[PDB]
Write a protein that binds this ligand. Structure first.
Ligand code: HEM
Ligand SMILES: CC1=C2CC[C@H](C)[C@]23CC[C@@H](C3)C1(C)C
Ligand SMILES: CC1=C2CC[C@H](C)[C@]23CC[C@@H](C3)C1(C)C
Length: 417
């Protein structure tokens, strides 16, 4: 048993500084300091795990509750700020309720709405007019998510707006003015929306009905908790996908050939996605280099041992899938965009947990199936009808926030055939 090694920072704010000047680099640097190192952001210490294996151990071990200190500092506030009181403490139990709505079985029924949201974009974006990625990706997001996870009365541009005016408050404890007119409205709306399905919610397999079949304000809190993160994430995701279709014409058109073969001409549909291999490979390779979620935290319940190191109980640990997915030691062409490094042969070349956009423990992403489905749909629909090109002056330099998104990605759909 050996306690972790330290890294290197300043007085009152140890690593709290290097991290400040550039988080993403600090996560990657930390990789060589030891399999698990200790770092100090000011007075308190956290532990970082920089090895795929230990990070998988880390997720697959039920001994790590997720108060995760530089997450629950906001989650204690998310107890008013967002989600509401908590988020998956223990028991879970009253939380398997969610699985039935996100399983591989309940996604093909969302398929139509998914197809519909995609092709719609397709007529929405027209060649020549640059697409505003931040405002627009954030939209198909809401729409898809809300529209499949709830059905009937449309929250259309109303839900979007609020979350928008919302998401922007985070970048640059809670806030000042219009973030207000958006919040109450976000809650005003979610409630109003629970009230309505109460009418005739028969077959609705979505999350709302299953959530109406398991607390009074506990439902108004679990939707606002599932809909919130999952949207900004499927969004940031979309964003990097746009940069992808615009940055590697090759695969973009390659993605258009794959779609035509299988689809023939008919607009892409859930059945097809399950066929479009290259379409998903693109989506994955992109998510590896530019994930939306780049750090993940936990809070040990019991004094642990990891990679032979002693993890003090009650401790607070942190890891970076960002870094992991971009670790040389884990990948050959470390920074090379290559949708084909996911080819069966090279695929096994890559460590077990060196690529898991979502995680493995019960703190996993219920929409793994749900996401890739709408993303693959959305990737295929766009690449097929267009070809994306990035407006000069476009700013695709990363902005490190809740998730990793492009400060100002500007692209123009061009007409393909
Ligand atoms: C852009 C694709 C997505 C990625 C990469 C992703 C990733 C993740 C990760 C890494 C976690 C939690 C890991 C942890 O703390 O242990 C998570 C949790 C979660 N995600 Fe996603 N997600 C995506 C899309 C979505 C969507 C579309 C929804 C639903 C609208 C969603 C809903 C959730 C929920 C409710 C949780 C909390 C799980 C828990 O309490 O353990 N996610 N996601
Ligand atoms: C201030 C901040 C954080 C608090 C800890 C949490 C992991 C993070 C680490 C860097 C990200 C997320 C930002 C900049 C949003
Ligand atoms: C994956 C993820 C989340 C799951 C829900 C939780 C509130 C969040 C919402 C966005 C933040 C925290 C990140 C991106 C780390």
């Amino acid at each position: 048993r050996e306690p972790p090694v330290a890294g290197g920072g300043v007085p009152l704010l140890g690593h709290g500084w290097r991290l400040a000047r550039d988080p993403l680099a600090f996560m990657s640097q930390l990789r060589d300091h030891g399999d698990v190192v200790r770092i100090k952001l000011g007075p308190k210490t956290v532990y970082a795990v920089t090895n795929p294996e230990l990070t998988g151990a880390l997720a697959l071990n039920p001994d790590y509750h997720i108060a995760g200190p530089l997450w629950e500092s906001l989650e204690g506030l998310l107890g008013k700020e967002g989600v509401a009181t908590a988020n998956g403490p223990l028991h879970r139990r009253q939380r398997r309720t969610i699985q039935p709505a996100f399983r591989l079985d309940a996604i093909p029924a969302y398929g139509p709405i998914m197809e519909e949201e995609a092709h719609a974009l397709t007529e929405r974006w027209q060649p020549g007019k640059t697409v505003d990625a931040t405002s627009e990706s954030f939209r198909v997001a809401v729409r898809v998510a809300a529209r499949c996870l709830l059905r009937g009365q449309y929250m259309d541009e109303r839900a979007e707006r609020l979350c928008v005016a919302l998401a922007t408050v985070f970048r640059g404890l809670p806030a000042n003015r219009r973030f207000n007119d958006a919040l109450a409205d976000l809650h005003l709306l979610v409630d109003e929306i629970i009230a309505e399905r109460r009418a005739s919610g028969q077959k609705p397999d979505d999350l709302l009905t299953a959530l109406l079949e398991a607390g009074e304000q506990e439902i108004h809190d679990q939707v606002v908790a599932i809909l919130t993160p999952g949207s900004e994430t499927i969004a940031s995701t979309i964003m990097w996908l746009l940069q992808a279709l615009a940055d590697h014409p090759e695969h973009a058109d390659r993605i258009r050939d794959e779609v035509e073969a299988v689809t023939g001409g008919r607009p892409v549909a859930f059945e097809d996605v399950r066929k479009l291999r290259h379409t998903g490979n693109v989506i994955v390779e992109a998510m590896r280099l530019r994930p939306a979620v780049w750090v993940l935290t936990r809070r040990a319940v019991a004094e642990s041992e990891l990679g032979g190191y002693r993890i003090p109980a009650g401790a607070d640990i942190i890891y970076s899938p960002y870094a992991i997915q971009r670790d040389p030691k884990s990948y050959d062409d470390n920074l090379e965009f290559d949708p084909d490094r996911w080819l069966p042969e090279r695929a096994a070349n890559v460590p077990k947990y060196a690529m898991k956009p979502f995680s493995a423990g019960k703190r996993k992403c219920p929409s793994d199936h749900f996401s890739m489905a709408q993303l693959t749909l959305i990737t295929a629909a766009l690449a097929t009808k267009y070809r994306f090109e990035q407006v000069a002056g476009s700013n695709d330099a990363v902005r490190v926030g809740i998730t990793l998104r492009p400060h100002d990605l500007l692209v123009r759909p061009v007409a393909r055939h």
